[PDB]
Amino acid sequence: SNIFEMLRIDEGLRLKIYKDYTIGIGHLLTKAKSELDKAIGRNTNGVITKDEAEKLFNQDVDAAVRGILRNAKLKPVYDSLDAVRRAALINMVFQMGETGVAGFTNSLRMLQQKRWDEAAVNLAKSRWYNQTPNRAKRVITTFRTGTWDAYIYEFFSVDEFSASVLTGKLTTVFLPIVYTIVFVVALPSNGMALWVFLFRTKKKAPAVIYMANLALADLLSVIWFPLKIAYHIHGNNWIYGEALCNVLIGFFYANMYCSILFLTCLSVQRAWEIVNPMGHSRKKANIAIGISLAIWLLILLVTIPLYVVKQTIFIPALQITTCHDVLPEQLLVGDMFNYFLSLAIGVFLFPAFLTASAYVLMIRALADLEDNWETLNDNLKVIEKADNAAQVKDALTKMRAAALDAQKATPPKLEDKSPDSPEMKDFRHGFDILVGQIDDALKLANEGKVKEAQAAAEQLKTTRNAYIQKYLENSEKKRKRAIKLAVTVAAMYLICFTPSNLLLVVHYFLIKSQGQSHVYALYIVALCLSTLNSCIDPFVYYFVSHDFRDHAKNAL
Ligand SMILES: C[C@@H](C1CCCCC1)n1c(-c2cc3c(cc2Br)OCO3)nc2cc(C(=O)Nc3ccc(C#N)cc3)ccc21
Numbered sequence: 329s330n331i332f333e334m335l336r337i338d339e340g341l342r343l344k345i346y347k348d349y350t351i352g353i354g355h356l357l358t359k360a361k362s363e364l365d366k367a368i369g370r371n372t373n374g375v376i377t378k379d380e381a382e383k384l385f386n387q388d389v390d391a392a393v394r395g396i397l398r399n400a401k402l403k404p405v406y407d408s409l410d411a412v413r414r415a416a417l418i419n420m421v422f423q424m425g426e427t428g429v430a431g432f433t434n435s436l437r438m439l440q441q442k443r444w445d446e447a448a449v450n451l452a453k454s455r456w457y458n459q460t461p462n463r464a465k466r467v468i469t470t471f472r473t474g475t476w477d478a479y480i481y482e483f484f485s486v487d488e489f490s491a492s493v494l495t496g497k498l499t500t501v502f503l504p505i506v507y508t509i510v511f512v513v514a515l516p517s518n519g520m521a522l523w524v525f526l527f528r529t530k531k532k533a534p535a536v537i538y539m540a541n542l543a544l545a546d547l548l549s550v551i552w553f554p555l556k557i558a559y560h561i562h563g564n565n566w567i568y569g570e571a572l573c574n575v576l577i578g579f580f581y582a583n584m585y586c587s588i589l590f591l592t593c594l595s596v597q598r599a600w601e602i603v604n605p606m607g608h609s610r611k612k613a614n615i616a617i618g619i620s621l622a623i624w625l626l627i628l629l630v631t632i633p634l635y636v637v638k639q640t641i642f643i644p645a646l647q648i649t650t651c652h653d654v655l656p657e658q659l660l661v662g663d664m665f666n667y668f669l670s671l672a673i674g675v676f677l678f679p680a681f682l683t684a685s686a687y688v689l690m691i692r693a694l695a696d697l698e699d700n701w702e703t704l705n706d707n708l709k710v711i712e713k714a715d716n717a718a719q720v721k722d723a724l725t726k727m728r729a730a731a732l733d734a735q736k737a738t739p740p741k742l743e744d745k746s747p748d749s750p751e752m753k754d755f756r757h758g759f760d761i762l763v764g765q766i767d768d769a770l771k772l773a774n775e776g777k778v779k780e781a782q783a784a785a786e787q788l789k790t791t792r793n794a795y796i797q798k799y800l801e802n803s804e805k806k807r808k809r810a811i812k813l814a815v816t817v818a819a820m821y822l823i824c825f826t827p828s829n830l831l832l833v834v835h836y837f838l839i840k841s842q843g844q845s846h847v848y849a850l851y852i853v854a855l856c857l858s859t860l861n862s863c864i865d866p867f868v869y870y871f872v873s874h875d876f877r878d879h880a881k882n883a884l
């Protein structure tokens with residue numbers, strides 16, 4: 329009588345009509361007094377006996393089996409199921425009626441094909457699971473395992489490797505310390521950066537706009553850290569509600585992916601202004617705003633399967649309510665794996681490829697412009713110290729080509745200036761005057777007039793400081809900031825993005841493959857070190873924003 333004993337645990341035993349109107353052991357009356365009097369045979373007046381419950385429950389089971397064999401969609405599955413799983417099917421028919429269970433056409437076909445795991449997942453996403461989760465879990469487990477374990481042992485604790493981490497000092501001492509540091513450092517730093525970009529930056533370039541959302545993504549996550557620190561200090565125990573847990577989870581992964589996308593935009597935008605600069609600083613800004621809105625809305629849509637799933641679970645053995653750290657429904661690991669594998673490819677690797685190659689083109693272009701300005705001054709310094717006509721004509725020729733290449737290059741100042749603008753035409757014209765004078769010294773150098781061409785070098789010095797040096801004065805300083813910028817971003821990927829996304833796939837891959845993951849400790853440290861991006865983000869603003877440097881230095 330295992331089926332009879334199983335149902336008693338699910339339906340309970342009550343001798344009075346109660347709201348789930350039912351009575352006895354899961355005997356449905358109506359959707360109640362009149363339906364009970366003719367079912368028993370007498371006027372029970374709402375209260376039945378302990379003996380009449382058993383007699384009516386034993387008849388409900390015999391009828392639940394007859395309907396199964398009567399049904400053309402329930403009989404073949406029932407004939408394929410082992411006696412343990414047969415009770416689970418009868419448990420559903422006992423609860424949802426013959427017709428209700430017959431609606432699960434796809435899962436019943438899976439159960440017939442002995443695919444217990446696939447059938448379990450299908451049953452986990454239904455109104456049945458939504459209305460009675462604890463009830464459905466026990467029945468679903470009976471299908472998946474084929475044992476009575478779901479009714480013998482109630483949930484008590486997680487795996488040993490997780491239970492030690494959730495009670496160890498790594499989570500209860502190390503994490504809140506690191507999180508506290510980030511809060512003190514990242515909140516006012518990004519707080520001031522957002523202030524500078526909005527109320528102190530009067531350029532409003534596409535770079536400022538991307539950095540403003542970067543600081544905003546930082547702020548919208550760091551503000552919740554006081555609740556995050558308290559969570560860990562008290563032994564990974566959440567007492568603030570399920571909705572507020574899913575908020576922190578949402579804003580955590582949001583800043584995680586906004587940072588990557590806004591890093592790719594900034595890096596590409598700043599690289600694009602050097603290779604092929606344009607001249608619509610007002611339109612390119614509006615575009616950059618729209619791109620930010622598109623990114624902001626795209627992440628709001630992609631973090632939906634994080635807002636809406638149960639992310640809290642009470643662990644009896646630990647007496648704590650964990651947020652995020654433990655997955656309440658171990659049947660969704662298949663969905664979780666694909667989800668974080670999609671993001672790791674399309675929102676991690678793909679933006680990393682565009683981010684890395686952007687600095688490849690950016691640094692090289694800034695390195696070439698540096699070499700031109702250096703070849704110019706060096707060859708101009710040789711002429712004043714060369715005696716033979718060979719070194720004079722040779723230095724003039726190398727200086728000529730150096731100025732012809734710098735003419736095609738974008739000056740550090742005219743970044744948002746289009747190549748057809750007057751500013752660019754005056755820049756190039758400054759070289760046309762210089763190049764012409766080099767030909768006037770080459771005219772003498774090629775006509776054998778050695779010393780007369782050396783005197784022209786002093787004339788070339790005047791043209792350098794007047795028309796050229798003004799634009800290329802601090803081009804080597806701009807290259808150094810770009811290199812440091814490439815280093816800052818590379819470090820942010822090496823510490824905050826790559827360990828998280830890599831382990832996120834590995835973590836859910838092992839729970840899907842073995843039911844436990846030994847990288848659980850690394851998974852937690854990865855997620856912890858991922859929050860450092862908002863502490864490294866101020867270094868990005870320092871190397872990109874010029875107005876932010878002023879407010880950074882003046883403050884300290
Ligand atoms: C557009 C922004 C705002 C920018 C203005 C300050 C409020 C945030 N935003 C972000 C966000 C926050 C971020 C971020 C990226 C995003 Br897309 O980076 C770090 O912080 N998450 C957001 C979430 C919501 C909502 O009601 N959801 C929601 C509610 C119920 C259910 C169910 N069932 C599912 C989802 C609304 C705006 C959100």
Ligand code: NA
Nearest residue numbers: 546587861862
């Ligand atoms: Na960030």
